[PDB]
Amino acid sequence: VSSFERFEIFPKTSSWPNHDSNKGVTAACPHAGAKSFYKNLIWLVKKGNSYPKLSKSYINDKGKEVLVLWGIHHPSTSADQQSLYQNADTYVFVGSSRYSKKFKPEIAIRPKVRDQEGRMNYYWTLVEPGDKITFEATGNLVVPRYAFAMERNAGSGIIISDTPV
Amino acid sequence: KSYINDKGKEVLVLWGIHHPSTSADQQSLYQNADTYVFVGSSRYSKKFKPEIAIRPKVRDQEGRMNYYWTLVEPGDKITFEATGNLVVPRYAFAMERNAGSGIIISDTPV
């Protein structure tokens, strides 16, 4: 890949009226001495004391291929599941003509890493032109906010070095 | 149950998950139904739901057991949690890699 266009596939202000996108921060990702998160993902939480169902989709109007990333939160205790998502025995679904996977969130006290007994797994996929990607969850979904449209160059690579540029 | 790596070098841990033939066999050996098994660490994170069927009888056994393994980094905790169908480790191994070694399949005498 050489070219790169960041666009708001799911805008923050809109597209989540029934869910909240503001308390999704953590101390594991600090910035400027404050609790922050990833700039391309939003940690959806319960709206007040309710996490309604999810049904969101996107269609590729950008022409070229699109790269989409998201995450699944796996809290430590069952109380943490209710405190952030209310509903229990939740499910997360991401589907398209290429991707089809349902994730059952699962709960355990994983070893504390960076002041966090929980874990989050980050996933990615590619969207073909004229293809719809669908999202559906009752909890434990970190929805994409900024996706990427790209075109492959050919002669490029990755170099690991400390050499100055 | 948990273990912390005080051995300094890496540790290899192995265990197993039993999958009985009939649901009666689940109660006869583990009582609880709809059990779950969890093994977790900074490297390993997997929950196994034991699942039950009459697999073909091999060595006088219609059930199956799957054997798993992982590596524990220095200063890392590995946690175990199950309501049944867990074959816990007893003897683990601490190791250091040499370099020039391998595996040879032969009938030649030593």
CA–CA distance from B54 to each of B19, B20, B93 (Å)? Answer: 10, 8, 34
- Give start and end residues of each alpha helix (H) in chain B: 23-30
Asked whether the beta carbons of A59 and A100 are under 8 A apart, the reply is no
Q: Determine, for residues A108 and B41 on separate chains, whether the beta-carbon distance falls below 8 Å.
A: no
Neighbouring residues of B77: CB distance < 8 A, sequence distance ≥ 6 = A111, B2, B3, B4, B5, B41, B42
Q: Which residue has the tokens 């559906």?
A: A136
Q: Which H/E stretch holds residue A95? A: strand A92-95
- Give start and end residues of each alpha helix (H) in B9-107: 23-30
Q: How far A111 CA sits from the closest chain B CA (Å)?
A: 6
CA distance A43 to A23: 8
Q: How is residue A150 written in tokens?
A: 């790209």
Neighbouring residues of A72: CB distance < 8 A, sequence distance ≥ 6 = A92, A103, A105, A120, A121, A123, A140, A141, A142
The bridge status of strand B93-95 relative to strand B10-19 is: antiparallel
Experimental approach: X-ray
Q: How is residue B97 written in tokens?
A: 């890699």
Report all structural domains of chain A as residue ranges with CATH numbers, in order of start.
1-165 (3.90.209.20)
Q: Pick from B47, B76, B81: which is nearest to A111 by CB?
A: B76
If we measure between CA atoms, which residue out of B27, B16, B19, B17 comes closest to residue B61?
B19
**CB interface of A with B, residues 73-132, below 8 Å:** 74, 106, 108-111, 113, 119
Selected for mutation to probe chain A from B2, B37, B42 (highest A CB count within 10 Å) is B42
Asked whether the beta carbons of A29 and A100 are under 8 A apart, the reply is no
The bridge status of strand B10-19 relative to strand B2-4 is: unpaired
The CA R_g of chain B, rounded to the nearest whole Å, is: 18
Residues facing residue B15 across a β-bridge: B68
Backbone phi, psi, residue A28, to 5°? -70, -15
Q: Determine, for residues B41 and A106 on separate chains, whether the beta-carbon distance falls below 8 Å.
A: no
Q: Determine, for residues A108 and B77 on separate chains, whether the beta-carbon distance falls below 8 Å.
A: no
Q: Which residue has the tokens 């599941």?
A: A81
Q: How is chain A split among helix, strand and coil, in percent rounded to 5?
A: 5, 35, 60
CA distance A146 to A67: 10
